[PDB]
Design a protein around this ligand. Structure first.
Ligand SMILES: [K+]
Ligand SMILES: [Mg+2]
Ligand SMILES: [Mg+2]
Ligand SMILES: [Mg+2]
Ligand SMILES: [Mg+2]
Ligand SMILES: [Mg+2]
Ligand SMILES: [Mg+2]
Ligand SMILES: [Mg+2]
Ligand SMILES: [Mg+2]
Ligand SMILES: [Mg+2]
Ligand SMILES: [Mg+2]
Ligand SMILES: [Mg+2]
Ligand SMILES: [Mg+2]
Ligand SMILES: [Mg+2]
Ligand SMILES: [Mg+2]
Ligand SMILES: [Mg+2]
Ligand SMILES: [Mg+2]
Ligand SMILES: [Mg+2]
Ligand SMILES: [Mg+2]
Ligand SMILES: [Mg+2]
Ligand SMILES: [Mg+2]
Ligand SMILES: [Mg+2]
Ligand SMILES: [Mg+2]
Ligand SMILES: [Mg+2]
Ligand SMILES: [Mg+2]
Ligand SMILES: [Mg+2]
Ligand SMILES: [Mg+2]
Ligand SMILES: [Mg+2]
Ligand SMILES: [Mg+2]
Ligand SMILES: [Mg+2]
Ligand SMILES: [Mg+2]
Ligand SMILES: [Mg+2]
Ligand SMILES: [Mg+2]
Ligand SMILES: [Mg+2]
Ligand SMILES: [Mg+2]
Ligand SMILES: [Mg+2]
Ligand SMILES: [Mg+2]
Ligand SMILES: [Mg+2]
Ligand SMILES: [Mg+2]
Ligand SMILES: [Mg+2]
Ligand SMILES: [Mg+2]
Ligand SMILES: [Mg+2]
Ligand SMILES: [Mg+2]
Ligand SMILES: [Mg+2]
Ligand SMILES: [Mg+2]
Ligand SMILES: [Mg+2]
Ligand SMILES: [Mg+2]
Ligand SMILES: [Mg+2]
Ligand SMILES: [Mg+2]
Ligand SMILES: [Mg+2]
Ligand SMILES: [Mg+2]
Ligand SMILES: [Mg+2]
Ligand SMILES: [Mg+2]
Ligand SMILES: [Mg+2]
Ligand SMILES: [Mg+2]
Ligand SMILES: [Mg+2]
Ligand SMILES: [Mg+2]
Ligand SMILES: [Mg+2]
Ligand SMILES: [Mg+2]
Ligand SMILES: [Mg+2]
Ligand SMILES: [Mg+2]
Ligand SMILES: [Mg+2]
Ligand SMILES: [Mg+2]
Ligand SMILES: [Mg+2]
Ligand SMILES: [Mg+2]
Ligand SMILES: [Mg+2]
Ligand SMILES: [Mg+2]
Ligand SMILES: [Mg+2]
Ligand SMILES: [Mg+2]
Ligand SMILES: [Mg+2]
Ligand SMILES: [Mg+2]
Ligand SMILES: [Mg+2]
Ligand SMILES: [Mg+2]
Ligand SMILES: [Mg+2]
Ligand SMILES: [Mg+2]
Ligand SMILES: [Mg+2]
Ligand SMILES: [Mg+2]
Ligand SMILES: [Mg+2]
Ligand SMILES: [Mg+2]
Ligand SMILES: [Mg+2]
Ligand SMILES: [Mg+2]
Ligand SMILES: [Mg+2]
Ligand SMILES: [Mg+2]
Ligand SMILES: [Mg+2]
Ligand SMILES: [Mg+2]
Ligand SMILES: [Mg+2]
Ligand SMILES: [Mg+2]
Ligand SMILES: [Mg+2]
Ligand SMILES: [Mg+2]
Ligand SMILES: [Mg+2]
Ligand SMILES: [Mg+2]
Ligand SMILES: [Mg+2]
Ligand SMILES: [Mg+2]
Ligand SMILES: [Mg+2]
Ligand SMILES: [Mg+2]
Ligand SMILES: [Mg+2]
Ligand SMILES: [Mg+2]
Ligand SMILES: [Mg+2]
Ligand SMILES: [Mg+2]
Ligand SMILES: [Mg+2]
Ligand SMILES: [Mg+2]
Ligand SMILES: [Mg+2]
Ligand SMILES: [Mg+2]
Ligand SMILES: [Mg+2]
Ligand SMILES: [Mg+2]
Ligand SMILES: [Mg+2]
Ligand SMILES: [Mg+2]
Ligand SMILES: [Mg+2]
Ligand SMILES: [Mg+2]
Ligand SMILES: [Mg+2]
Ligand SMILES: [Mg+2]
Ligand SMILES: [Mg+2]
Ligand SMILES: [Mg+2]
Ligand SMILES: [Mg+2]
Ligand SMILES: [Mg+2]
Ligand SMILES: [Mg+2]
Ligand SMILES: [Mg+2]
Ligand SMILES: [Mg+2]
Ligand SMILES: [Mg+2]
Ligand SMILES: [Mg+2]
Ligand SMILES: [Mg+2]
Ligand SMILES: [Mg+2]
Ligand SMILES: [Mg+2]
Ligand SMILES: [Mg+2]
Ligand SMILES: [Mg+2]
Ligand SMILES: [Mg+2]
Ligand SMILES: [Mg+2]
Ligand SMILES: [Mg+2]
Ligand SMILES: [Mg+2]
Ligand SMILES: [Mg+2]
Ligand SMILES: [Mg+2]
Ligand SMILES: [Mg+2]
Ligand SMILES: [Mg+2]
Ligand SMILES: [Mg+2]
Ligand SMILES: [Mg+2]
Ligand SMILES: [Mg+2]
Ligand SMILES: [Mg+2]
Ligand SMILES: [Mg+2]
Ligand SMILES: [Mg+2]
Ligand SMILES: [Mg+2]
Ligand SMILES: [Mg+2]
Ligand SMILES: [Mg+2]
Ligand SMILES: [Mg+2]
Ligand SMILES: [Mg+2]
Ligand SMILES: [Mg+2]
Ligand SMILES: [Mg+2]
Ligand SMILES: [Mg+2]
Ligand SMILES: [Mg+2]
Ligand SMILES: [Mg+2]
Ligand SMILES: [Mg+2]
Ligand SMILES: [Mg+2]
Ligand SMILES: [Mg+2]
Ligand SMILES: [Mg+2]
Ligand SMILES: [Mg+2]
Ligand SMILES: [Mg+2]
Ligand SMILES: [Mg+2]
Ligand SMILES: [Mg+2]
Ligand SMILES: [Mg+2]
Ligand SMILES: [Mg+2]
Ligand SMILES: [Mg+2]
Ligand SMILES: [Mg+2]
Ligand SMILES: [Mg+2]
Ligand SMILES: [Mg+2]
Ligand SMILES: [Mg+2]
Ligand SMILES: [Mg+2]
Ligand SMILES: [Mg+2]
Ligand SMILES: [Mg+2]
Ligand SMILES: [Mg+2]
Ligand SMILES: [Mg+2]
Ligand SMILES: [Mg+2]
Ligand SMILES: [Mg+2]
Ligand SMILES: [Mg+2]
Ligand SMILES: [Mg+2]
Ligand SMILES: [Mg+2]
Ligand SMILES: [Mg+2]
Ligand SMILES: [Mg+2]
Ligand SMILES: [Mg+2]
Ligand SMILES: [Mg+2]
Ligand SMILES: [Mg+2]
Ligand SMILES: [Mg+2]
Ligand SMILES: [Mg+2]
Ligand SMILES: [Mg+2]
Ligand SMILES: [Mg+2]
Ligand SMILES: [Mg+2]
Ligand SMILES: [Mg+2]
Ligand SMILES: [Mg+2]
Ligand SMILES: [Mg+2]
Ligand SMILES: [Mg+2]
Ligand SMILES: [Mg+2]
Ligand SMILES: [Mg+2]
Ligand SMILES: [Mg+2]
Ligand SMILES: [Mg+2]
Ligand SMILES: [Mg+2]
Ligand SMILES: [Mg+2]
Ligand SMILES: [Mg+2]
Ligand SMILES: [Mg+2]
Ligand SMILES: [Mg+2]
Ligand SMILES: [Mg+2]
Ligand SMILES: [Mg+2]
Ligand SMILES: [Mg+2]
Ligand SMILES: [Mg+2]
Ligand SMILES: [Mg+2]
Ligand SMILES: [Mg+2]
Ligand SMILES: [Mg+2]
Ligand SMILES: [Mg+2]
Ligand SMILES: [Mg+2]
Ligand SMILES: [Mg+2]
Ligand SMILES: [Mg+2]
Ligand SMILES: [Mg+2]
Ligand SMILES: [Mg+2]
Ligand SMILES: [Mg+2]
Ligand SMILES: [Mg+2]
Ligand SMILES: [Mg+2]
Ligand SMILES: [Mg+2]
Ligand SMILES: [Mg+2]
Ligand SMILES: [Mg+2]
Ligand SMILES: [Mg+2]
Ligand SMILES: [Mg+2]
Ligand SMILES: [Mg+2]
Ligand SMILES: [Mg+2]
Ligand SMILES: [Mg+2]
Ligand SMILES: [Mg+2]
Ligand SMILES: [Mg+2]
Ligand SMILES: [Mg+2]
Ligand SMILES: [Mg+2]
Ligand SMILES: [Mg+2]
Ligand SMILES: [Mg+2]
Ligand SMILES: [Mg+2]
Ligand SMILES: [Mg+2]
Ligand SMILES: [Mg+2]
Ligand SMILES: [Mg+2]
Ligand SMILES: [Mg+2]
Ligand SMILES: [Mg+2]
Ligand SMILES: [Mg+2]
Ligand SMILES: [Mg+2]
Ligand SMILES: [Mg+2]
Ligand SMILES: [Mg+2]
Ligand SMILES: [Mg+2]
Ligand SMILES: [Mg+2]
Ligand SMILES: [Mg+2]
Ligand SMILES: [Mg+2]
Ligand SMILES: [Mg+2]
Ligand SMILES: [Mg+2]
Ligand SMILES: [Mg+2]
Ligand SMILES: [Mg+2]
Ligand SMILES: [Mg+2]
Ligand SMILES: [Mg+2]
Ligand SMILES: [Mg+2]
Ligand SMILES: [Mg+2]
Ligand SMILES: [Mg+2]
Ligand SMILES: [Mg+2]
Ligand SMILES: [Mg+2]
Ligand SMILES: [Mg+2]
Ligand SMILES: [Mg+2]
Ligand SMILES: [Mg+2]
Ligand SMILES: [Mg+2]
Ligand SMILES: [Mg+2]
Ligand SMILES: [Mg+2]
Ligand SMILES: [Mg+2]
Ligand SMILES: [Mg+2]
Ligand SMILES: [Mg+2]
Ligand SMILES: [Mg+2]
Ligand SMILES: [Mg+2]
Ligand SMILES: [Mg+2]
Ligand SMILES: [Mg+2]
Lengths: 48, 275
RNA sequence: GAGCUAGCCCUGGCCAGGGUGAAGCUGGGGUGAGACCCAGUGGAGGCCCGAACCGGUGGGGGAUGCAAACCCCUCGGAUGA
RNA sequence: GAAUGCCGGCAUGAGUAACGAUAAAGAGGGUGAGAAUCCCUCUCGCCGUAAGCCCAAGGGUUCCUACGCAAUGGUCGUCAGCGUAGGGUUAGGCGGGACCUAAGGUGAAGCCGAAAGGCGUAGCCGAAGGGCAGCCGGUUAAUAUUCCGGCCCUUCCCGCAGGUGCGAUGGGGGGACGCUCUAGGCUAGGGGGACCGGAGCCAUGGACGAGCCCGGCCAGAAGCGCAGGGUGGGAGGUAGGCAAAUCCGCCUCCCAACAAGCUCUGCGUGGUGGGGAAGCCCGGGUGACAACCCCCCGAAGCCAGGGAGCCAAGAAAAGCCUCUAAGCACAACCUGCGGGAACCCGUACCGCAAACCGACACAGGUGGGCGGGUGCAAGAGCACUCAGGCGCGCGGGAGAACCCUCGCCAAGGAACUCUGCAAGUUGGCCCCGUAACUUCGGGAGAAGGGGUGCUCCCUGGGGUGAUGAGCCCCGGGGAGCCGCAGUGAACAGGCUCUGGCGACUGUUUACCAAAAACACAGCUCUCUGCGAACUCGUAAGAGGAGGUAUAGGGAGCGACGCUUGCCCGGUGCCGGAAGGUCAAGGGGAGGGGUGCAAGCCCCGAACCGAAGCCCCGGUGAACGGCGGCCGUAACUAUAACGGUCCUAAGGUAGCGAAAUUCCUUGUCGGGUAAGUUCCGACCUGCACGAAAAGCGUAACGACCGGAGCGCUGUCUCGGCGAGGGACCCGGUGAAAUUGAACUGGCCGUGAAGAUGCGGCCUACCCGUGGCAGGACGAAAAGACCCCGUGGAGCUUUACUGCAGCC
RNA sequence: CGAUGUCGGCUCGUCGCAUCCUGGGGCUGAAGAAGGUCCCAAGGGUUGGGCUGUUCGCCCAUUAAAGCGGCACGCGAGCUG
RNA sequence: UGGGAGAGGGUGGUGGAAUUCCCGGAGUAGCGGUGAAAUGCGCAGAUACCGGGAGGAACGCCGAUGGCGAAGGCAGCCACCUGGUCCACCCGUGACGCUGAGGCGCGAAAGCGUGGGGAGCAAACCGGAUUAGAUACCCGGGUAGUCCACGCCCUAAACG
RNA sequence: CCGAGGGUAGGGCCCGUGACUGGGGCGAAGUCGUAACAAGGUAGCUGUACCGGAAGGUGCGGCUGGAU
């Protein structure tokens, strides 16, 4: 049947992307924390 | 004269439509339409604030002239009577001798080809607009400004009218569509005559699809819900109210007056409504 | 977190074929004039049958499955909410 | 040593289930150490509104080639979407950007918020919508509307020439629009030809033929032809389109009006460039100087911004045209021609799937376009087939039980069973014919029947064409032929009567309920005078609504018909400028602390003092409620009638053993051989009853009862047969579970149901296929139940608060 | 209670005997025939249907007879639901 | 042809009396109702009086033993539209007539449907009295209805 | 071919019968009340509507076949 993951590059970048995170207190904390944690990617990869 | 249908579907048995016979133009004046932003009942938060709205036919808004004192003394010709989907009344297209074109709502009896005019000296004729002080007591009247130069506010729906009943200082007494007796300032403009298309009220939508075409989505009785949803929700089997009938938000809904008490305009309502 | 799902907004797309034959129109009759009747024209409808499409009624299978809801047969809607 | 402990390793089950659609295989020849599985050939089967082809999304090198086979591949592997390497994606015209705006998002102005932040006009962003210039063929192992060829085209820059009041982010026009139906003319596509071109062919009884087989085009600028779309012309006035305006709007006059003219597309033609089958031979070469013609069918596509009708009344902005303003008229713009200039990103490949979403090469899911032929009334249905693509990545045998999917069945025909569950029956088209009832539409495909193939003859109309031939479409009659059977295969209702519920089409518990539940038109009550009420928000601000009482919110009822009785004492809501109570506050009688005192300080009576409450009224489609006992008639029985107690008032009409009836299978009637169900009645209604509506109701229903006809493997009552498994052999090889086990029966005993204790009995050791009685078998720390001063949802006249409102 | 699945039906039986029938008997208010009642006896047998989920029961038509109980109200790792 | 009388019909408008309600004023201890009363209304200021206003319905006197219409029926006043009818003259047509099964139209009240309207009146209903009872008569309330438009109903002691 | 008739199916009309139900007629001495006849003690009658154990009552409009 129809599953829950329906990839969509525009939806991925616009929802979880770098610029969505920086435009919001919570998202900037998500960036702060993933940097402190030393994540290799701060943001989901989408090819655009 | 509402038009019936033969019962050749279950829904056509009761469905009635307007006759549209007063209509002489069937596409709007391009320079007077603009897109009507459909809301679904949602405010600027995205939140539903008026339940069960949405999904009705697309409409363009006809810009209507509810002032009519921008062009005092300039006569106009009535060029057409058109369908307006944004109101119950029909609208009338006016050609001013200016060349300027404007929509007013079509009073009852207005005939294509006649002239109308606005101002303190206008004849007392169906279609004409005067400040209230110059309209003779007894006159049936519509599209009544409620405060000078703020725009026509009262008696705009199909068939409605206000009657001038008397005068008192700067104010005149109106019997509003609802029966209420209210002082309105004399400088407030009104238009002579009742609003047209009085058969509107006798339309029988006939089926649920018709409500859907108007942007009306199904209304769910609180008695059909659960207690998390509504004061009337719950109960094994069917259930009477079991408490004073209440809204979704808890407040009582049979009799409870809701006009704010200390409202400055109370000094101007003479007698609350009738019937 | 509304890339699932629920609702709404904006902008596009889709619905083989067959059937029924509303109003109106025209003519004929009718009458004081009419209502009205008749025939032709017409092509209405949350109209009918049925694919796509959307469903999920009953039964059988499946039950460490092909599948964490599927398969077969059957069945509902299919110009409309 | 235990924690259903944690991490890891390794066992058991077991060579067991399984190896993922039952569309299907066989052989020969290659290659290789090795071949059912790789390659080639021939035979066979499967898809063909796809299981083929082209887009988009998503994926991201999987594409092509060489070399490989450890692992991945459910077996094998020499093969591969796998490993290593090399190569491969070429655009002014395709898509997107250097254009436009939609929702929405953002946001100079501005507004609001403890902070964070929330709003918000313009503007900006934002596309699968608007707008915009490339078609046909060739080439690569792999890209191509991109490279090449041929023919076309756009914008920008500069120039030359001609022309003009040139000039805009401003004004105006235009862009610019719905649904259903649809005309004319075309094209796409397809059928046929005795015509043109073609390698060949004559089989096996016949055919050298008007034979078989194959093909008979595609693009194309200007011009012209055809079909359409768009559009009046002139003058005078002018106060409107937030400056101006010759524009546009409005008024008047004149000429034109199915037209014409001008303009723009579509199609045809068109200089020219291409392509070009079968077969034969080895992707290619031939065929081939290939031919490239005629007739017919014909779109849902094109002309298009076409036409008609209808109500629910159908985006915006730019490009573009016109108008003028600053300006500038040496400029500038329009037109024609010439030269120059023309950037960024995508382009491989999969794409209904082994490359996307489902942990898997997963029977699931995934939007748009093309989707050929013949027959079946039509069609995208169905059968078979084209082009094209496949046989589904374990096989070989055997022909047990049993299971699955399937076929048939003597006599019977629902006797099966909770139930005709299931499966039969019926089944398309044509014609005949069709009841109660009805809201006059319907019920209706009611029911029930007859026809249906092929041949010959006569004959009617229509389209194309010419008015004819041909082609093509719709028919009428007559005479016959065959078989068991002519919608001969595939696809295609069983029917009727009678109840309950719900009017109806719709909607719902994604994944155990599709319903009588929700919704629904419609009815009523109620709130709401507009800065509405109401809703979200601390607010600003929104929605309501650019609406205005024929409107908007809330509530109940639920088409329609006939109706909806009595009670306002309690609760609610509505009304009541009196009275009673009533907080802060006003007032200050009268005290008190202190000080030498002026003072300073604290308490404080009457009285005045809001909402609320009390109190007085109203109000039922507001919350709700609508009695008891005893007696009585000239047979009896029963009480129209009476007595009395109580109530705020004692249930009306209608209906009633009911989706409600306890006693109950009430009683009587019907249906049946027989009827706890069903239907119709009766009424002592445990415990109907009038908008939580009452009683009905045509039509409707995958709703739930009862009955009958038809027909059946449901059954008496089972038999046979098919295929896929089960079974045997080769290959690969799990799982839950498991204290250890050397693990029998009875009668007893035992924590009360013993392989394990006692006595007796029986029993050589180990397997395979089967069956499920036990191992209180597995699974899941029982959902029931109780317990915990455990939790959560919900309610209210429980408590106590808060928002909100007064 | 770290689970002993709970009515009825179907299938499949097996057992007890306080015996429904068949066999053998005594007493009889046993003429005969048919019964009544008790004794012995478990070898076998003990029907088909209507109603209801029903067990049971009632009814229809038969019968030699239409027996009563146990087996976790026998039997859901056998089926139904 | 010339004239007449008339509540004949339809439409539009419009006048004054009275009632009820509302607002202001003034005033206070009852009003109302009957056979008598009670319910009811009234110190929260009723009744009685004055002024203002809203609204509906019916038109006093004239008015009659009157008039008109086929009937049912028709009454303030104005205008418009329209019917029947009588008289005069003796002008025109030349029996063109009478009745009339069917058909068609009209048809008081009440009633019904969809809207509107609602002052007074008033089935139902509530209460107070009366009575053995009083589902009546009388009294206080009161909803349909009575009024308008359109569409039905088609009855009558529709009688002379 | 037609054809008595037979069979399948569906209609129409009439007759009988049916739990139960509706009123109607009649029947020496039942119960309730007193609606009409007199102004019948509220003049009666009337078509319609609504209500009530029952006759009846009430509303609307009509008739005199109403008395004084
Ligand atoms: K329980
Ligand atoms: Mg889904
Ligand atoms: Mg889907
Ligand atoms: Mg998605
Ligand atoms: Mg995307
Ligand atoms: Mg996207
Ligand atoms: Mg997206
Ligand atoms: Mg976002
Ligand atoms: Mg982002
Ligand atoms: Mg911050
Ligand atoms: Mg920060
Ligand atoms: Mg990571
Ligand atoms: Mg790094
Ligand atoms: Mg992130
Ligand atoms: Mg109708
Ligand atoms: Mg009709
Ligand atoms: Mg109109
Ligand atoms: Mg516009
Ligand atoms: Mg808006
Ligand atoms: Mg916004
Ligand atoms: Mg709301
Ligand atoms: Mg809404
Ligand atoms: Mg309108
Ligand atoms: Mg409106
Ligand atoms: Mg005012
Ligand atoms: Mg209308
Ligand atoms: Mg209405
Ligand atoms: Mg609408
Ligand atoms: Mg509604
Ligand atoms: Mg509802
Ligand atoms: Mg509920
Ligand atoms: Mg519920
Ligand atoms: Mg919630
Ligand atoms: Mg709550
Ligand atoms: Mg609640
Ligand atoms: Mg409740
Ligand atoms: Mg409930
Ligand atoms: Mg209940
Ligand atoms: Mg419920
Ligand atoms: Mg109930
Ligand atoms: Mg209650
Ligand atoms: Mg409440
Ligand atoms: Mg409130
Ligand atoms: Mg009011
Ligand atoms: Mg369709
Ligand atoms: Mg026709
Ligand atoms: Mg027409
Ligand atoms: Mg339909
Ligand atoms: Mg049909
Ligand atoms: Mg299913
Ligand atoms: Mg589904
Ligand atoms: Mg089935
Ligand atoms: Mg299974
Ligand atoms: Mg499952
Ligand atoms: Mg399936
Ligand atoms: Mg199927
Ligand atoms: Mg079907
Ligand atoms: Mg269809
Ligand atoms: Mg259908
Ligand atoms: Mg230990
Ligand atoms: Mg351990
Ligand atoms: Mg543990
Ligand atoms: Mg562990
Ligand atoms: Mg390790
Ligand atoms: Mg481990
Ligand atoms: Mg291991
Ligand atoms: Mg071991
Ligand atoms: Mg092993
Ligand atoms: Mg092995
Ligand atoms: Mg085993
Ligand atoms: Mg397995
Ligand atoms: Mg498997
Ligand atoms: Mg598997
Ligand atoms: Mg299959
Ligand atoms: Mg095979
Ligand atoms: Mg082979
Ligand atoms: Mg091999
Ligand atoms: Mg090998
Ligand atoms: Mg091969
Ligand atoms: Mg061969
Ligand atoms: Mg095909
Ligand atoms: Mg991937
Ligand atoms: Mg390998
Ligand atoms: Mg190897
Ligand atoms: Mg290998
Ligand atoms: Mg290696
Ligand atoms: Mg492997
Ligand atoms: Mg695999
Ligand atoms: Mg090799
Ligand atoms: Mg690897
Ligand atoms: Mg490549
Ligand atoms: Mg190019
Ligand atoms: Mg571009
Ligand atoms: Mg640039
Ligand atoms: Mg954006
Ligand atoms: Mg953009
Ligand atoms: Mg675009
Ligand atoms: Mg081109
Ligand atoms: Mg190359
Ligand atoms: Mg210019
Ligand atoms: Mg337009
Ligand atoms: Mg438009
Ligand atoms: Mg559009
Ligand atoms: Mg339409
Ligand atoms: Mg072409
Ligand atoms: Mg063809
Ligand atoms: Mg000017
Ligand atoms: Mg075009
Ligand atoms: Mg050559
Ligand atoms: Mg189409
Ligand atoms: Mg078009
Ligand atoms: Mg058009
Ligand atoms: Mg815009
Ligand atoms: Mg200048
Ligand atoms: Mg110059
Ligand atoms: Mg020029
Ligand atoms: Mg650039
Ligand atoms: Mg690039
Ligand atoms: Mg490419
Ligand atoms: Mg698929
Ligand atoms: Mg597709
Ligand atoms: Mg693939
Ligand atoms: Mg997942
Ligand atoms: Mg995996
Ligand atoms: Mg595979
Ligand atoms: Mg797959
Ligand atoms: Mg073909
Ligand atoms: Mg067919
Ligand atoms: Mg295969
Ligand atoms: Mg397949
Ligand atoms: Mg074998
Ligand atoms: Mg199968
Ligand atoms: Mg067969
Ligand atoms: Mg056979
Ligand atoms: Mg048989
Ligand atoms: Mg039978
Ligand atoms: Mg039979
Ligand atoms: Mg049966
Ligand atoms: Mg069932
Ligand atoms: Mg069939
Ligand atoms: Mg019948
Ligand atoms: Mg019939
Ligand atoms: Mg019937
Ligand atoms: Mg019936
Ligand atoms: Mg009918
Ligand atoms: Mg038939
Ligand atoms: Mg025949
Ligand atoms: Mg034949
Ligand atoms: Mg023969
Ligand atoms: Mg069918
Ligand atoms: Mg329902
Ligand atoms: Mg329904
Ligand atoms: Mg119902
Ligand atoms: Mg109904
Ligand atoms: Mg309904
Ligand atoms: Mg439907
Ligand atoms: Mg469900
Ligand atoms: Mg569920
Ligand atoms: Mg659930
Ligand atoms: Mg679920
Ligand atoms: Mg299910
Ligand atoms: Mg359903
Ligand atoms: Mg529901
Ligand atoms: Mg309904
Ligand atoms: Mg209703
Ligand atoms: Mg209403
Ligand atoms: Mg709030
Ligand atoms: Mg705050
Ligand atoms: Mg707004
Ligand atoms: Mg409303
Ligand atoms: Mg409902
Ligand atoms: Mg309901
Ligand atoms: Mg009460
Ligand atoms: Mg009260
Ligand atoms: Mg009360
Ligand atoms: Mg209660
Ligand atoms: Mg109570
Ligand atoms: Mg009643
Ligand atoms: Mg009963
Ligand atoms: Mg009942
Ligand atoms: Mg029930
Ligand atoms: Mg009950
Ligand atoms: Mg019972
Ligand atoms: Mg019972
Ligand atoms: Mg019984
Ligand atoms: Mg019987
Ligand atoms: Mg009884
Ligand atoms: Mg009751
Ligand atoms: Mg209720
Ligand atoms: Mg019904
Ligand atoms: Mg009826
Ligand atoms: Mg019915
Ligand atoms: Mg249904
Ligand atoms: Mg259903
Ligand atoms: Mg049956
Ligand atoms: Mg039967
Ligand atoms: Mg069988
Ligand atoms: Mg077999
Ligand atoms: Mg062997
Ligand atoms: Mg092996
Ligand atoms: Mg392996
Ligand atoms: Mg051991
Ligand atoms: Mg051992
Ligand atoms: Mg052992
Ligand atoms: Mg043993
Ligand atoms: Mg024991
Ligand atoms: Mg034992
Ligand atoms: Mg032992
Ligand atoms: Mg031992
Ligand atoms: Mg021992
Ligand atoms: Mg032992
Ligand atoms: Mg022992
Ligand atoms: Mg033994
Ligand atoms: Mg074995
Ligand atoms: Mg075995
Ligand atoms: Mg076992
Ligand atoms: Mg077992
Ligand atoms: Mg087994
Ligand atoms: Mg145990
Ligand atoms: Mg066991
Ligand atoms: Mg066990
Ligand atoms: Mg489990
Ligand atoms: Mg636990
Ligand atoms: Mg536990
Ligand atoms: Mg548990
Ligand atoms: Mg529970
Ligand atoms: Mg317990
Ligand atoms: Mg406690
Ligand atoms: Mg405790
Ligand atoms: Mg607790
Ligand atoms: Mg337990
Ligand atoms: Mg356990
Ligand atoms: Mg248990
Ligand atoms: Mg367990
Ligand atoms: Mg059985
Ligand atoms: Mg014996
Ligand atoms: Mg025996
Ligand atoms: Mg025995
Ligand atoms: Mg039984
Ligand atoms: Mg039992
Ligand atoms: Mg029983
Ligand atoms: Mg037993
Ligand atoms: Mg025992
Ligand atoms: Mg027991
Ligand atoms: Mg028991
Ligand atoms: Mg048992
Ligand atoms: Mg059992
Ligand atoms: Mg089971
Ligand atoms: Mg069981
Ligand atoms: Mg078990
Ligand atoms: Mg067991
Ligand atoms: Mg007093
Ligand atoms: Mg006083
Ligand atoms: Mg009034
Ligand atoms: Mg004469
Ligand atoms: Mg003469
Ligand atoms: Mg009448
Ligand atoms: Mg009384
Ligand atoms: Mg007395
Ligand atoms: Mg009244
Ligand atoms: Mg008379
Ligand atoms: Mg009397
Ligand atoms: Mg008397
Ligand atoms: Mg009397
Ligand atoms: Mg009365």
């Amino acid at each position: 049947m129809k599953r829950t993951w329906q990839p969509n590059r525009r939806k991925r970048a616009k929802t979880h992307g770098f610029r969505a995170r920086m435009r919001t207190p919570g998202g900037r904390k998500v960036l702060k924390r993933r940097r402190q944690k030393g994540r290799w990617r701060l943001t989901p990869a989408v090819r655009k | 004269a509402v038009k019936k249908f033969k019962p050749y579907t279950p829904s056509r048995r009761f469905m009635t439509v307007a006759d549209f016979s007063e209509i002489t133009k069937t596409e709007p004046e391009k320079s007077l339409v603009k897109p009507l932003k459909k809301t679904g009942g949602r405010n600027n938060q995205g939140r539903i604030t008026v339940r069960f709205r949405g999904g009705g036919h697309k409409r363009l808004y006809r810009i209507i002239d509810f002032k009519r004192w921008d062009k005092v003394g300039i006569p106009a010709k009535v060029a057409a009577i058109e369908y307006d989907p944004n109101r119950s009344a029909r609208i009338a297209l006016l050609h001013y001798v200016d060349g300027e074109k404007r929509y007013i709502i079509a009073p009852d009896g207005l005939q294509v080809g006649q002239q109308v005019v606005a101002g303190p000296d206008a004849p007392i004729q169906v279609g004409n607009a005067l400040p209230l002080r110059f309209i003779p007591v007894g006159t049936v009247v519509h599209a009544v400004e409620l405060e000078p130069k703020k725009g026509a506010k009262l008696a705009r729906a199909a068939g409605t009218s206000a009657q001038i009943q008397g005068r008192e200082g700067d104010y005149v007494i109106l019997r509003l569509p609802s029966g209420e007796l209210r002082k309105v300032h004399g400088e407030c403009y009104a238009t002579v005559g009742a609003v047209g298309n009085a058969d509107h009220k006798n339309i029988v939508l006939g089926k649920a699809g018709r409500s859907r075409w108007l942007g009306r989505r199904p209304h769910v009785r609180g008695a059909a819900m659960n207690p998390v949803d509504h004061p009337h929700g719950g109960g094994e089997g069917r259930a009477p109210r079991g408490r004073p009938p209440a809204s979704p938000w808890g407040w009582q809904t049979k009799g409870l007056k809701t006009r704010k008490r200390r409202k400055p305009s109370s000094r101007f309502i003479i007698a609350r409504r009738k019937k």
